[PDB]
Amino acid sequence: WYYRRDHFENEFVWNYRTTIEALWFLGGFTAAAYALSVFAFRQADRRSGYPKRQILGDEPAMVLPDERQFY
Amino acid sequence: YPGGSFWSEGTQTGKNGFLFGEVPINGQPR
Amino acid sequence: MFLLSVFFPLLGGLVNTSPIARFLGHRGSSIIAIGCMVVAFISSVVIYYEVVFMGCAVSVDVFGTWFSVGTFHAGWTFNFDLLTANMLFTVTGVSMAVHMYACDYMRQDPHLNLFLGYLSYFTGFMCVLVAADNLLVMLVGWEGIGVCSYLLIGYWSHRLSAVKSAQKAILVNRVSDGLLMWGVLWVWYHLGSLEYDLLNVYSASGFVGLSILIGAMGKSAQILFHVWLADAMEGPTPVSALIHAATLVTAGVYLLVRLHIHDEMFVIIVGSLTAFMAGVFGATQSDLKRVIAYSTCSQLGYMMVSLGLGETGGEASMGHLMTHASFKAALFLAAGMVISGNGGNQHIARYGGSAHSAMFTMLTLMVASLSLIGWPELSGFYSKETILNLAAICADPIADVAHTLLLLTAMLTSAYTTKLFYQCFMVDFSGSSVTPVRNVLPILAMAILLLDIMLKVWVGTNLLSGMLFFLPWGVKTLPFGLMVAGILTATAAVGSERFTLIRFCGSRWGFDQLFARSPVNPIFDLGRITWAIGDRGLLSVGNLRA
Amino acid sequence: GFGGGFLDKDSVTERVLHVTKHFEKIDASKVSPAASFEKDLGLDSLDVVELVMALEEEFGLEIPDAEADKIASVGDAINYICSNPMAK
Amino acid sequence: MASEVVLALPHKLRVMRMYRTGLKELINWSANRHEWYPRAYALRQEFEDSKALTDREEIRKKLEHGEELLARFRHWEPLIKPEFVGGTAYSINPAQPKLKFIPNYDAMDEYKKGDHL
Amino acid sequence: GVFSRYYNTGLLCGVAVASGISIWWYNRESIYVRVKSDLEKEGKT
Amino acid sequence: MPKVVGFQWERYEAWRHHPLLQFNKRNAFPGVGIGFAAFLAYVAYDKSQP
Amino acid sequence: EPSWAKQLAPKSGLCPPEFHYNREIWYPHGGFYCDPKGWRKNTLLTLGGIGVLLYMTFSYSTANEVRHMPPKGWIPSIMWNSNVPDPVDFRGRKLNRDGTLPEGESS
Amino acid sequence: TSLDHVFGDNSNKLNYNFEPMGMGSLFIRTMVMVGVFFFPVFIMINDDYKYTSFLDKVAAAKAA
Amino acid sequence: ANAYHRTYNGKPVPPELQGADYITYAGVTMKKEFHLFDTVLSKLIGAGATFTCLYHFYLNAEEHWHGDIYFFEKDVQQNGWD
Amino acid sequence: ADRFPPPPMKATQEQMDAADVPYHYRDYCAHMYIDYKECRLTSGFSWRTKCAHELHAYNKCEYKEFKRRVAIAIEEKRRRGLIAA
Amino acid sequence: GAGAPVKLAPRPDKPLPTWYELWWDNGYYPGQPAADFMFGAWPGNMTETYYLRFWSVFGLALAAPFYYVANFTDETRMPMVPQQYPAEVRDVLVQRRNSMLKHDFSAPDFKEVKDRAKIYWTPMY
Amino acid sequence: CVRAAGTARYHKCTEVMKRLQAAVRVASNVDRGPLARKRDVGFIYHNNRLRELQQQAAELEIENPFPAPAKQATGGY
Amino acid sequence: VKPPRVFPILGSPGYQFFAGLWTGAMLTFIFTSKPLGRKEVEDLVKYDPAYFPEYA
Ligand SMILES: CCCCCCCCCCCC(=O)SCCNC(=O)CCNC(=O)[C@H](O)C(C)(C)COP(=O)(O)O
Secondary structure, eight states, X not given: OHHHHHTGGGGOOOOHHXXXXXXXXXXXXXXXXXXXXXXXXXXXXXXXXXXXXOOTTSOSOBOSOOTTSOO | OGXXXXXXXXXXXXXXXXXXXXXXBXXXXX | OOTHHHHHHXXXXXXXXXXXXXXXHHHHHHHHHHHHHHHHHHHHHHHHIIIIIHOOOEEEEEEEEEEEETTEEEEEEEEEOHHHHHHHHHHHHHHHHHHHHHHHHTTTOTTHHHHHHHHHXXXXXXXXXXXXXXXXXXXXXXXXXXXXXXXXXXXXXXXXXXXXXXXXXXXXXXXXXXXXXXXXXXXXHHHSXXXXXXXXXXXXXXXXXXXXXXXXXXXXXXXXXXXXXXHGGGSOHHHHHHHHHTSTHHHHHHHHHHHOOOOHHHHHHHXXXXXXXXXXXXXXXXXXXXXXXXXHHHHHHHHHHHHHHOHHHHHHHHHHHHHHHHHHHHHHHHHHHHHHHTTTOOBGGGOOSSSSSOHHHHHHHHHHHHHHTTOSSSHHHHHXXXXXXXXXXXXXXXXXXXXXXXXXXXXXXXXXXHHHHXXXXXSOOOSSOOOOOOOHHHHHHHHHHHHHHHHHHHXXXXXXXXXXXXXOHHHHHHHHHHHHHHHHHHHHTOOOSOHHHHHHHHTGGGHHHHHIIIIIHHHHHHHHIIIIIIIIIITOOOOOOO | OOSSSOOOHHHHXXXXXXXXXXXXXXXXXXXXXXXXXXXXXXXXXXXXXXXXXXXXXXXXXOOOHHHHHHOOBHHHHHHHHTTOSSOO | OOOHHHHTSOHHHHHHHHHHHHHHHHHHHOSOHHHHHHHHHHXXXXXXXXXXXXOHHHHXXXXXXXXXXXXXXXXXXXXXXXXXXXXXXXXXXXXXXXXXXXXXXXXXXXXXXXXXX | OOOOHHHHHHHHHHHHHHXXXXXXXXXXXXXXXHHHHHHXXXXXX | OOOOOSSOHHHHTGGGGOGXXXXXXXXXXXXXXXXXXXHHHHHIIIIIOO | OXXXXXXXXXXXXXXXXXXXXXXXXXXXXXXXXXXXXXHHHHHHHHHHHHHHHHHXXXXXXXHTEEEOSOOSSOOGGGGTOSSSOOOBOTTOXXXXXXXXXXXXXXX | OTTHXXXXXXXXXXXXXXXXXXXXXXXXXXXXXXXXXXXXXHHHHHXXXXXXXXXXXHHHHHOX | OOSEEEOOTTOOOOGGGOBTTBEEETXXXXXXXXXXXXXXXXXXXXXXXXXXXXXXXXXXXXXXXXXXXXXXXXXXXXXXXX | OOSSOOOOOOSOHHHHHHXXXXXXXXXXXXXXXXXXXXXHTTSTTXXXXXXXXXXXXXXXXXXXXXHHHHHHHHHHHHHHTSSOO | OOOOOOOBOOOOOSOOOTTOTTEEOOSBSSOEESSTTSSSOOTTOOOHHHHHHHHHHHHHHHHHHXXXXXXXXXXXXXXXXXXXXXXXXXXXXXXXXXXXXXXOTTSTTHHHHHHHTOOOSSOOO | OHHHHGGXXXXXXXXXXXXXXXXXXXXXXXXXXXXXXXXXXXOHHHHHHHHHHHHHHHHHTSOOSSOOOOSOSBSOO | OOOOSSSGGGGSHHHHHHHHHXXXXXXXXXXXXXXXXXXXXXXXXHTOTTTOGGGO
8 A cells, every 4th residue: 555655656647537626726726826926916016106017028117116216 | 549548658669661761780870 | 929820830830740740649749739729829819809909900021022023022021900810810710629620530540640730731821821911922822722722632642532622623723823813913014013002993904803703713612613612521521621611712702802803793693693502502412511511602602792792891701701710610520520420421311319429519510500590699690691781782783683692592501501400410310320429629629619609799800790780670580580491491301392403403503514524525635636636647757768 | 359350250140140030921930040031031032132231231231232142041141241341 | 224234134133133222212312211111111012013913025114114213313422331332431541552672772783873875 | 301292382371471461561651650659659658 | 001011121220219319308408598597697687677 | 570670660559450551661750650659758849949939930020020000009019029109099199008098188 | 353242343344435525516615615714815806896996987987 | 339239139138238327228228328528518608608699689689679770760759869 | 962961070081090990981970980999999898888879879870871861862763753752 | 440441453454445544543443534424424324415405594594683683773773872971082982993882873973973984804005 | 101001091192102103114114125015004094095085986976885084093093 | 201209290280381381481571572671761761851841
C-alpha cells in the first residue's frame, strides 16, 4: 500500500471524472482567485485616490505613485 | 490508603524510571 | 494582592507539572493545588470587595511590552475593572471547589497529578484572559484555555471517542478564532490601539460586530456551533464542570460584554434560536451529562439575548453569568457523585430510591435545580426575571419573538430539570450499584458552591437586582407559572405518540450528520483531488525513458 | 481476593440455579448442574432468550449474540460465566 | 429489515434474535424497568398468538413485517453497560503491554551514532 | 414516558379556560380607577 | 387473562422495593423546619411588635 | 530478572496490584501512583518555596500598582501600600486615610 | 482472539467501499461551502456594484 | 463491599448479617446506618437556604401579590407624589 | 413631548462625575440613583433593610418617568391618528 | 477501577483500499472512521434525505415569525417611548448604532435619527 | 486621560483621542508605500464620502440607498 | 403503567388532568400576555384626567 501511494503517479488517466474535476475545481478556483486579486488591487487603488494603474499587459499608464505627490 | 490514613509513611525508594535511559553501573559516576 | 489572582494558579500548575511533582506524589500534588486555589481565591475575594464596593480600578505593568512593530503596540499589561473583578472572582470561586472535587473523584486514577496540573493551567489561563487590557492578551488567554481544554478532554488518551471529540471542538474553536482574529485586525486598523479603554465606537463597518459575534458564538457553543459541547462529556467530570461553569463557555459572552460593539438584531436572533434549540434538546435525551450541557447552552443563549438588549441588558447578562456558574458547577458535581455511587452508570434509566447516595448530595442537587429553574426568590430567579422583564420592554419588534421563545425555553428548562431529579431519586430503583461515597472534600465543595449561591442572593451582583420595572401583574407571574407547568408535566413524566418528532428531537436535529458530509467529506475529496490529480497528475512532470 | 478477574465456580452455580427456578412450568428438584434447557426443563426459545437476558442482568453482562445462541443448557451458561472476567 | 448476517440465521435463531432485540429496544424506549415489565409481558403474549403457525409464506410475512417495524425503531441512544463495547467506561485505562527497554544507548558505539553518507 | 389521554383533555380544557381568562382580562376597568375605588373601600374603615 | 408467562420479571427484581432501597421522605427537606422556626422568631422579634 | 530491576522501586501500595505498567519508564511527572518515602518533608519544602515566591510577587505587585482615581471608601490595601491615593467619596468630599468623615462635618 | 467470546469476534465485516463521493453532490456541496464561508467577498463586491450603480445614475442624470 | 447483599436460592441468611444493623427484604439485606457530619452539614445548608428564601420573600411579598404598577399607583394615590 | 415636558434636572454633570455614574443612567432621576448607589454600596449584607427608603424613592421617581413616557407615547399616537381622540 | 481488559485490533491481512486514510485504528477494537456518520450506519438508521425533507419545512416554520414581525409591525406597538435623557446626555447615547434609543418615534429628528442608523459593510473612500 | 476620567470620558477625553488618531493617521498614511490603501482610523473618508453622496442624491431627487452620514463614529472623531 | 410506589398519587387521573390543564393554560398565556399587558399599561394612564382630561 505504501509503495503504491508513494508511486501513485502511474494511476493518472484522462477519464471523464478526472477532467471534469480538474477543470471545474483547479482551473476554476485559479480563475476565481485571480479575478479576486484583480478586484482587490483595483479597489485598493480606488481607496487611495489613484487613477487606473498598468498591470502586466494593461497599456502604458501610471505606475508607482510618487512620494512627492499628494493623491 | 496505606496505613489507613492520609498522613502515613511513604512507600517508594529507589530509582523512579531512567532519565534518558542512563542506568548507574557499580556506583561509578556516569 | 492584585497579581496574586493570576500568577499564583500558573505557578501552582507549573510546579504540579514540573519534575518536582515526582518527589511529591498525589497527596502532595493535591495539597499544593488546594493551597494555590485557596490563596488565589482569597486574593480574588479581596480584589472583588475593593473594586465592586469602593470602585478602585488598578492597571498593572507586568513584563513591559510583548511586541511593538509599526503603529501596532502590544504590552503585557493588566487592568482590573468591575468586569475583570467579577470574572476573576467567579472563576476562582468555581475552580477552587472544582479542584477540591477533583482531588477526591479521581483518587484511584493513575496520573492524577497531571490532571490537577492541567486544571490549574486552565484556571490560570482563564485568569490571564480576563486580566487582559488589550486584545492580544485576550487572544492569548483564548488559545491557552483552548489548549488546556484539548489536553483535559484527551486526558484518557486510550479512548478514541474522546480524541475525536477533542479534535472536533478544537477545529470548531479554531474557526471561531480565525473569525476573531479577522475582527481584531479590523478593530486595530480602524481604531489604532488594542486597550479596551481606548475602544469607544458608535458605528463600525458591520464586519466588526459580525465577526466578533461569530467568534464568540464559537466558544459559547451557540447555534451552528453547539455540536461539540455534548461530546465533551467523554472527559472527566471535573473538566466538564470547570468548562461549563465559569470558563471557556463564558469567555465569548465576557468578550461581548467587554466590547458592546455588536448588532442587536443578529445577537437577539442567534440567542433566541440557540436557547430554543438547547431547551428542546435537554428534555429529549437520557444521558445525564448531555442534559446539563444543553442547559448550559440555554443559559448562554439567555445571556446573549440580555447583552443584545443593551448596556443594562449587558450588565444583567454578566450577573446572569455570575449566578449561573455556581449552580452549573454544583449540578455537574452532584451528577458526578451520583454517577460514582451508581458504579459509573451515566444513564438515567437505572436509578431510583434514596439508598445509592448521601443526603447532602441530594439536597445540593435539589437546591441547584431550584435555583436554575427560577424558583421564586432564588439566585437564578433574580437574573432570569430581570432579563425577562428587560426583554418584555424592548424597543425591537424582533425581540417579541425572542420573548416568547425564551418563555417556552424556561418552561422546558423546568420540565427536564424536574425530570432529572425525578429519575434520580423519586422513581423506583432500576440499576445495580450502591456505593454511597461520603468523603468530606466533595461535600465541602458542594457546601462552598451553595454558600456562594446564598451570597449571590443575600448580596446582589449589581444594582440591577431590586430595580423595579413596571409590568402588569400577570406578566411578572408568567415565568413562575411556566416553571409550575414544567413541574407538573415532569412529575407526570408523560410522553406523546408522535414518534417521528421524538426520533427527530433525539437525534439533535441531525446537525452532526449534516456537517459530517456537507463540508467534511468534500474537504477530504478536495484533498485527494488536489494531491493525486494535480501534483501526481496535471502538475506532474514524468520521465523521458531512454 | 481470588481469581485473575474471575469468580468462583460455586457462587456462579448457586446464582445460576437461583435464577433458573423462576418459571411456573419448572419443578425445583429437576434443576441441577449441566441441565438441558429444552429436553429437560421444557422451556421454549422465548424462555431461553428471557433466561439469557435475566442472567445478563444478574451478572451485569452484555453477551454477544453468537455466544448467546450457543447457550442451550445450564452447564454451558455456567462455564461461559466461568470464562468471563467482566462478570460481577 | 434485519442485516444480511441476521438474514442468514436459522428460522428459530432468527425469531429468537428478533424477540431479544425487541426486548432490548423496549428497554431502550422505556422510562424505567418498571415501565418495561408490562411491555415485556405484552411482547411475550404477542408471540404466543403466533406459536401454532405453519404456512411458511404467512410466517415469512409476519417475520418481515416485524423486522421492518424493529428497523424503523432503532434507538439513537442505546442503554449500554459502561464497561462494554460502546459504553462510556470502555477503553479508559488498560494494562500496559510489555515494552522492552534499552539501557544506556548513548554509551554504546560512541562517535558512531550519526548517519551514513 | 407515559401516555395519558387525561393529560390531553387537561391541555384542551386549559386552553379553553385561559382563552376565557384572557377575554375576562380584556374588558377590565382602568388600574387607576380600580385603585381609587379600593381606596374608597379603604377610606371607610 | 393469564399474564404469568415467560420468566415474570416483576417478581424477579421485586427485591428492588426494599424499604431502605426507597426514597426517604423523612429527610427529603432537611433543615427546612429549623429555617421556618428561625424565620418566625425573626419576624416576631423585629417586625410584629416593634 | 534483569540486573537493573534491583535499582527500581516496586509498585506502590496505591497502585492496583493486578496492574503492570512497565515500571522502567521515566515520566516527567512521576509516572503511576507515585508516592515517595520522604514525601512530607518534600511537601514542606515545596510549601516554603511557594511562600517565598508568594512574598516576591507580593512585593512586586505592591511596587507596580497604579491607581488612577481615588477609591470610594476604606480598603485594606492601605495597610500595606502608601502609594494608594486618599479616597474621595461619591459626593466629592475628600476623606482621611482611615476612610471616615473629617471634623467640621463629622459628629 | 482470547476476548472474542467476551466482546465479539472479527466475523462481522465493515460495509464500506472506499469510494469517492458523487460528482454532482460533491460539486454542489463545495459551492455551498464556498458561499457560506466566503460571504465577505460577495458583500464587498455587491457593495462595489451598488456604489457603481449609484455613480452610473448620477452620471446619467447630471449630463442632460 | 456492596451495601446490599444478595442471598439467592433461599439460603439461610448469615447470622452475623442479621440484627438491628441489617434489614432484609425479599431475602436481600440492607443496613440501617447513620452519618453524623453528613447529616449535620445537610441540615445546616438546608436551613440556610430555607431561611434565605423565606426572609427575602417576606421583604418583597407586596411587590409580588400585587403588581409594581398597582403597589406604586396605590402609594402615589395614598402617600403623595413627591 | 411638548405636552409633557421633562422636569428640570436636579443633578449636575459634576455631581454625576463625583458619584461615578454610568453615563446611560444619567436620567431625570439621577439624584435618586446616586443616593441609592451610595447607600447600597456601603451597607454590606443588610442592604435591603437600611436602604429601603432610598430604593422606594428611586423607584417612585422611575414610576413618574415611566408614566411620562407612556403619556408621551399616547399623545404622539393621538396626534398621528393611531388612537381615537 | 482502571485496568479493565480490552480487546486489541488485529492487523489487516488483505490488500488495503486506495483511500484507507479515513479509518481511525487506535490499536484497540472497535475502530472508527475519520469522522462519525461519514460512512456506514447511523444510529436510528435515518438518512440524509429524511433530515433534508424535515428541515425543508422546519426552517421556514422557525423563520416565518421573524420576517412577519420585521416587515409588518413597527415601534408604535410598544405603549411607551424609550427612557428619556437630557439633550446633552441623549446626544451621545444615540450616536451608537446599536443603541436602542433610536426607536423613539417621538424624537424631534426621528426619521433623521433612523437615517443615520443604517449599517454599511465596505468603508467608502 | 481615560483612566483618570472614568465615566466622564465621553465629554472629557475627546480632544486627546482626536490628537492620538491624527498621529496614527500621520504615521500610517505618510510614506504609506506603493500598494497600501489609505487608512482612516476616524472613518473620516467614509463619512466625508457619505456627506458628498448625500448632497449628490439630494440634488438627484431620489431616495438615499446609503446610511445618513454620522457626526462622529468613535470616542475621538 | 404503574406509578412509583412511594408516590402512587401521581398516577391518579385527576392529577394528570390538572397538570394538563395548567400546562395548556400557561402555554397559551405565553402568547396572550403581551398585547393584554400593553393595553393595560396604556389605559393605566389613558383614563387619568391628570394627563388626558378629554378621556376622563
Ligand atoms: C416495538 C415493537 C416493534 C415490533 C416488534 C415485532 C412484533 C411483531 C411480532 C409478531 C410476529 C411474530 O411473532 S413472528 C412468528 C413466530 N412464530 C412462527 O413462526 C410459527 C412457529 N414456528 C416455529 O418454528 C417455532 O414454533 C417458533 C415459535 C418460531 C420457535 O419456538 P421454539 O424454538 O421454542 O420451538
